[PDB]
Write a protein that binds this ligand. Structure first.
Ligand SMILES: Nc1nc2c(ncn2[C@@H]2O[C@H](COP(=O)(O)OP(=O)(O)OP(=O)(O)O)[C@@H](O)[C@H]2O)c(=O)[nH]1
Ligand SMILES: *[C@H]1C(=O)c2c(O)cccc2C(=O)[C@@H]1C
Ligand SMILES: *[C@H]1C(=O)c2c(O)cccc2C(=O)[C@@H]1C
Ligand SMILES: *[C@H]1C(=O)c2c(O)cccc2C(=O)[C@@H]1C
Ligand SMILES: [Cl-]
Ligand SMILES: [Cl-]
Ligand SMILES: [Cl-]
Ligand SMILES: [Mg+2]
Lengths: 208, 995, 121
């Protein structure tokens, strides 16, 4: 059970960062602009079985746009992303919506205002009305604090499976193997450990 | 082999292209990725358009044809006007032929909607270029070709919808004002013929797909067409009856009727009023008979989410709220429209119970509009009694916590208005909801919390007497609920809700001292409960009650021996003994609020002294030991005590401001010695352990001391009233302690908080310390610039604080820049332009503001050598850096301020504020005015940067732009027209004459 | 997890060292659990992410493992894991786990040793 999900929005809104947090659990701090599209399989475990999103993470910058609406063909669902700290990114939501629906007329679409962790919010709640007449779901999210980070997928999954009570569930956890550390690679591990202990964990001010 | 399509030397193999595309869309992992890079390079090849007609004729893969049309779209939008007329007609005929052909084949029409819609959009891109001037017959032929087939008729409605969107909905950013006006007038002129065609299909149409495509185009027409096409034809009746009855057409029809409700309409016309009423009556009758009655459980339906129910219910909410916000007064005065009015509202009540936050917000905006009107408008509230009663229950059951600021605000305001309209009904609903908490039927943490937020939200709406009886009843009830609940989780929830409600009723507290005291003493008892959330809630409630009731803590109450502030302070050690440090600081912050109420100077200083007794004694013993032995700071546990002392000083200074000065005076000299001692230890640790030292808990602890010292001083100086004392006592020791330490640390050890503190100093007393501002610049300018002038990402806090500092120095103490040596002044101008190129919007905005202010500062100087040398050195750098960021597409959030800066620079030359010639001698005739030369320099600069523009385009642009150097909105329009024309070839130069 | 007793539960953020990029990469945040298999009496770390409940750690608390401090933190441990099955096929990782406080981290170290001694039997 796999669905093509297209992720669109202005450069620097957090599309690649959001997907990576979902893929690996990591928070990428650096901005490396996507070139055309990155495709990644993303699987969730539900009470109704596993659901797979083939996530088409598209380029937001015109100069790295590649095939543009060429990426939208046979999309079954979409996320439009903006940055609540950048007014221009919300101003552009109608442009991304336009390009998307001209190719995909009848697909569930979530509008996501990313970076709600930042204290100086520029696109206020009151301003975000574009979703109403377009029947988009809307969520405030933060890829950084993980605020509502599961909501866009849980909503799309409910729409695509056609079950409003669909829940994410704990994947059953296989018994981990007992192994003995190899005497040959014992010296190797000490090195790798030394480097890791003398590199600081990021974000030492955070609650975790 | 996939890379073969990239070699254009040989003719394209369609079969290979179809494999690459297939591999891209249907392949996986490594293969998909390589096909992606290859298709991208193919598409981006500037000659790939020459392959489009070959791909469209001979490709089997409809994805290939899609990508071919994108390649064609790039040519049509960018380079169309370079093509000979015969080649443009060739492409036109080819595209129209492919559309008509795909429509005539029932199988392709049905299954290839993607490619047909992309073709239609490609055709609309040709119409934007060619129509009507080079294609006058387009509309007559489209209208003609529509009667030949139902597939072509349907597809022609898609073309007209796309044409309407492109000309009216999406033209603002994508065309020049002149071109948008031309296409709008052109569609307006031909609309009578387009409408006839749409009306005929709607009147006589048999095919649902055709009918839906026609209504989809109509929804686009309603954004711009005059009202008479809706009201003076049969169309209103067809929308509000026939098309509401069938579920194929019902969602699009409801969206049309929402847009009809927004048409610009005459106000003074009984017949139009009757038609406006009639289409509403017809639509609600079709809903009640064909979809669901007024009693239907829409919450249940929406939840079940069968087919398109969720979209339809959202569309119904939008239609009802839009029509009623404009028209409910048409329904209010006539007895025969009463049932229609209340049915429409009853549907809105049922929509408001749906569990869907974004829908709830749409309906809440309508309810806010309605209850605000009932609050002000005479003889209206009685109509809506039953709607209002139901709405009270929907709002109370949906109240969110105050942390969800916008939603809580909207809900509170609606509930406050409803409470005014019928206080008894609000009170009864709240008391009976509390009874269902106590009897357990509706008991849950979420439910008691929700009810508590609702009860809190209406504070101040009742009379003091009604409020008193109400508050007593609620506290009595919540206390009974508390006693009745088992286990500390349940008791903590109810305790939190009691504290919450009490904190929202200050008026009650201020009139009942005996109760206020008990509340405070109970909050003090709760500060010893380590059960999660209880201490934090006790402290938050304490400071919230203090902010509102502070005067009651500072007077001697009758039957008390002293002001309660004295009682709080005396027992502060015991009260706060079990709190986490951040909770202690909140507690001390709250005491500072109270002490600031005492306006007797001697009594305030004495209270401040007593409040600071514990941190001052811990401080004094640390300083005794610290001065005796330098090594004692190394100890992790002392560093934590020192930081918490400084944080307590920051917390009290935060609430006391100017009144904090005697406490700052007591610690100031040893605090700055501590700053220097801590700095040496950090320097010592970095030398001994490396840059890694700055990540260690020990050094982060020491840095915390330095940051809290800076935060204390910036906190005081930002609220200081006696600036003479600031300048005479605080500023010299502060600069001595911080500036050299900042300058002589390695970049990674430098605190951006120094820049922030220095900004506050220059802000508040910059005019009184001109030599101090010079010293600040000399200490921080060149070394901070070197941290941030290598990329846009390193040292983001320094980057931000650095431009805030230059901004305020340039505002308050521009003399410091005159004292800079020329090389340093050049670095300053370079730094400003650097801020312009930033994607960081804090920096970019300060950058543009510094540039604006610097112009004004230089202008102010008048006709002297410094000003003259500045213009000769930097005028053209500022003009070209501003043009660069206006045109490169990477800085669109700055557009307004970039335009303002460019206008100001251009206007300097027009107003003869630049005395010397800006051109070096023998570059032009020696008499030539700077005004004439500016235009020559700009033409040359635009010609090099944009070589595809004609001389005529640049000269017309510059003639328009310069003349609008006083009018910012028109100036911005000219710039936007230029940003459109630079994206294409052969832009019309007469576009710059738009008016 | 129905055949296992919970010996210890604590909120934590888990990192894995990427030697290539020479940086710590977050793997997840949620409840870290010491689970005692009721058949074998073997104690594992099982850690699930908030909201998704996806597994970010699943490995035996091997007696050979040693919790080391990180230079940046007084509320973290780093240790080498020979065989973690969170992402499927058993892999070697250098892990770091950070807690809300020094107290939680010391308590974790205490439980991780008590678990190592159960796993020696
Ligand atoms: N504060 C904050 N920063 C975030 C958040 N999400 C992403 N970022 C940062 O913002 C930038 C976003 O980068 P990407 O996720 O690569 O942006 P993108 O939308 O993929 O951009 P393109 O690929 O160019 O379209 C990075 O620096 C992220 O670390 C968030 O929730 N909060
Ligand atoms: C297009 C069309 O197909 C049609 C149908 O289906 C019925 C009646 C009239 C017509 C037209 O002529 C429309 C223009
Ligand atoms: C529980 C309770 O919360 C309470 C507060 O909060 C103040 C005063 C008295 C009480 C009780 O006795 C309740 C049982
Ligand atoms: C102002 C202006 O800047 C200008 C320049 O710079 C050149 C020529 C004409 C003008 C104007 O007429 C504007 C009023
Ligand atoms: Cl018009
Ligand atoms: Cl009205
Ligand atoms: Cl008062
Ligand atoms: Mg990206």
């Amino acid at each position: 059970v796999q669905f093509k999900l297209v992720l669109v929005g202005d450069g620097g809104t957090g599309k690649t960062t959001f997907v990576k947090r979902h893929l690996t659990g990591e928070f990428e701090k650096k901005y490396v602009a996507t070139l055309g599209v990155e495709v990644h399989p993303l699987v969730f475990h539900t009470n109704r079985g596993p659901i797979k999103f083939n996530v088409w993470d598209t380029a937001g910058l015109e100069k790295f746009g590649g095939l543009r609406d060429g990426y939208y063909i046979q999309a079954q669902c979409a996320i439009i992303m903006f940055d609540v700290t950048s007014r221009v990114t919300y101003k552009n939501v109608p442009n991304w919506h336009r390009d998307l629906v001209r190719v995909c007329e009848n697909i569930p679409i979530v509008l996501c205002g990313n970076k709600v962790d930042i204290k100086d919010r520029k696109v206020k709640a009151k301003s975000i009305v574009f979703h109403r007449k377009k029947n988009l779901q809307y969520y405030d999210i933060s890829a950084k604090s993980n605020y509502n980070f599961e909501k866009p997928f849980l909503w799309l999954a409910r729409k695509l499976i056609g079950d409003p009570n669909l829940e994410f569930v704990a994947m059953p956890a296989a018994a981990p193997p007992e192994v003995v550390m190899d005497p040959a690679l014992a010296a190797q591990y000490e090195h790798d450990l030394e480097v890791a202990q003398t590199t600081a964990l990021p974000d030492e001010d955070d609650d975790l | 082999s996939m890379e073969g399509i990239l070699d254009f030397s040989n003719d394209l193999d369609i079969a290979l292209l179809d494999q690459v595309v297939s591999t891209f869309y249907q392949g996986e992992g490594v293969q998909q990725k390589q096909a992606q890079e290859i298709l991208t390079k193919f598409q981006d090849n500037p000659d790939a358009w020459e392959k489009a007609d070959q791909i469209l004729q001979f490709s089997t893969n409809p994805q290939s044809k899609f990508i071919a049309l994108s390649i064609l779209d790039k040519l049509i939008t960018r380079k169309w006007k370079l093509l000979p007329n015969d080649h443009r007609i060739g492409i036109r005929n080819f595209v129209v032929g492919m559309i008509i052909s795909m429509c005539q084949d029932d199988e392709v029409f049905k299954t290839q909607k993607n490619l047909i819609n992309k073709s239609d959009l490609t055709l609309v891109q040709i119409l934007k270029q060619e129509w009507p001037q080079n294609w006058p017959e387009f509309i007559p032929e489209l209208i003609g070709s529509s009667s030949s087939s139902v597939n072509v008729c349907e597809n022609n409605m898609i073309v007209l919808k796309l044409l309407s969107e492109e000309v009216f909905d999406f033209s603002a950013e994508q065309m020049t004002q002149a071109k948008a006006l031309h296409l709008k007038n052109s569609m307006s002129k031909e609309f009578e013929q387009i409408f006839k065609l749409c009306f005929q299909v709607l009147e006589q149409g048999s095919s649902s797909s055709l009918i839906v495509a026609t209504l989809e185009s109509l929804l686009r027409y309603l954004h711009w067409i005059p009202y008479r096409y809706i009201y003076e034809t049969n169309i209103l009746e067809l929308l509000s009856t026939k098309f509401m009855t069938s579920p194929d057409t019902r969602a699009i029809t409801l969206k049309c009727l929402t847009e009809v409700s927004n048409l610009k309409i005459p106000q003074d016309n009984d017949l139009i009023k009757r038609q406006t009423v009639l289409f509403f009556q017809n639509t609600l009758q079709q809903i009640a008979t064909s979809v669901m009655p007024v009693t239907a459980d829409l919450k249940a339906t929406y939840a079940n989410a069968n087919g398109n129910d969720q979209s339809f219910l959202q569309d119904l909410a939008m239609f009802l709220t839009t029509y009623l916000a404009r028209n409910r007064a048409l329904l209010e005065s006539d007895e025969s429209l009463r049932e229609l009015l209340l049915n429409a509202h009853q549907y809105l009540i049922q929509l408001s119970k749906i569990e869907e936050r974004e829908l709830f917000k749409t309906t809440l905006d309508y309810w806010h509009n309605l209850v605000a009107d009932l609050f002000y408008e005479p003889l209206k509230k009685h109509i809506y009694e039953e709607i209002c009663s139901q709405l009270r229950l929907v709002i109370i059951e949906n109240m969110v916590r105050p942390e969800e600021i916008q939603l809580y605000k909207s809900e509170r305001e609606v509930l406050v208005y409803l409470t005014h309209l019928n206080v008894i009904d609000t009170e009864e609903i709240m008391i009976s909801k509390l009874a269902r908490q106590i009897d357990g039927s509706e008991w849950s943490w979420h439910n008691i919390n929700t009810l508590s937020w609702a009860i809190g939200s209406i504070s101040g709406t009742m009379s003091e007497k009604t409020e008193k009886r109400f508050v007593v009843t609620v506290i009595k009830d919540l206390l009974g609920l508390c006693e009745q609940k088992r286990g500390k989780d349940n008791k903590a929830v109810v305790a939190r809700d009691i504290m919450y409600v009490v904190g929202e009723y200050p008026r009650f507290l201020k009139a009942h001292w005996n109760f206020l005291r008990t509340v405070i003493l109970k909050l003090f008892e709760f500060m010893h409960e380590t059960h999660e959330g209880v201490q934090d809630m006790a402290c938050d409630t304490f400071i919230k009650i203090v902010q509102k009731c502070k005067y009651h803590f500072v007077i001697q109450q009758p039957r008390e021996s002293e002001p309660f502030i004295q009682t709080i302070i005396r027992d502060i050690q015991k009260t706060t003994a079990d709190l986490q440090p951040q909770q202690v600081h909140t507690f001390y912050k709250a005491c500072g609020i109270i002490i600031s109420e005492e306006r007797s100077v001697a009594e305030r200083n004495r209270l401040l002294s007593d409040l600071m007794q514990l941190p001052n004694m811990a401080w004094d013993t640390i300083v005794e030991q610290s001065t005796a032995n330098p090594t004692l700071l190394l100890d992790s546990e002392t560093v934590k005590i020192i930081a918490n002392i400084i944080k307590t000083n920051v917390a009290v200074c935060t609430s006391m401001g100017a009144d904090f000065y005697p406490q700052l005076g007591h610690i100031y000299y040893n605090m700055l010695q501590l700053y220097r001692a801590v700095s040496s230890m950090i320097s010592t640790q970095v030398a001994a352990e490396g840059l890694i030292a700055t990540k260690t808990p020990k050094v982060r602890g020491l840095r915390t001391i330095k940051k809290e010292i800076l935060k204390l001083v910036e906190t005081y100086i930002s609220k200081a009233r006696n600036l003479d004392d600031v300048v005479k006592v605080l500023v010299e020791p502060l600069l001595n302690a911080v500036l050299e330490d900042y300058m002589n640390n390695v970049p990674d050890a430098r605190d951006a908080e120094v820049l922030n503190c220095m900004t506050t100093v220059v802000e508040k007393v910059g005019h009184m310390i001109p030599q101090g501002v010079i010293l600040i610049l000399q200490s921080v300018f060149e070394c901070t610039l070197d941290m941030i002038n290598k990329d846009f990402t390193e040292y983001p806090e320094h980057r931000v604080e650095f431009y805030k500092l230059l901004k305020v120095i340039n505002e308050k103490s521009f003399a410091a820049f005159l004292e800079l040596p020329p090389a340093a002044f050049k670095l300053f101008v370079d730094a400003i332009c650097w801020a312009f190129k930033h994607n960081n919007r804090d920096v970019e905005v300060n950058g543009l503001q510094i540039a604006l202010d610097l112009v004004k500062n230089i202008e102010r100087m008048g006709n002297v050598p410094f000003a003259n040398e500045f213009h000769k050195n930097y005028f053209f750098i500022f003009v070209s850096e501003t043009f660069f960021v206006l045109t490169d597409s990477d800085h669109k959030s700055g557009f307004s301020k970039q335009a303002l800066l460019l206008m100001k620079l251009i206007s300097l030359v027009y107003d003869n504020k630049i005395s010397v010639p800006l051109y070096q001698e023998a570059e032009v005739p020696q008499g030539t005015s700077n005004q004439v030369y500016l235009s020559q320099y700009l033409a040359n600069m635009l010609s090099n940067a944009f070589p595809h523009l004609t001389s005529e385009q640049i000269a017309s642009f510059l003639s328009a732009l310069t003349k609008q150097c006083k009018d910012l909105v028109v100036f911005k329009g000219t710039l936007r027209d230029f940003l459109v024309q630079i994206k294409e070839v052969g832009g019309d130069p007469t576009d710059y004459l738009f008016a | 997890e129905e055949d296992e007793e919970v010996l210890y539960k604590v909120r934590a953020k888990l990192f894995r060292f990427d030697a290539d990029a020479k940086e710590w990469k977050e793997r997840g945040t949620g409840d870290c659990k010491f689970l005692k298999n009721k058949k074998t009496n073997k104690v594992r770390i099982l850690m699930r992410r908030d909201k998704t409940l996806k597994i970010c750690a699943n490995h035996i608390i091997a007696p050979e493992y040693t919790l080391k401090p990180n230079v940046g933190s007084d509320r973290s441990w780093v240790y080498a894991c020979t065989a973690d099955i969170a992402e499927g096929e058993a892999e070697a990782f250098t892990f770091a786990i950070r807690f809300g406080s020094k107290e939680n981290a010391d308590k974790f170290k205490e439980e991780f040793e008590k678990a190592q001694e159960i796993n020696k039997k």
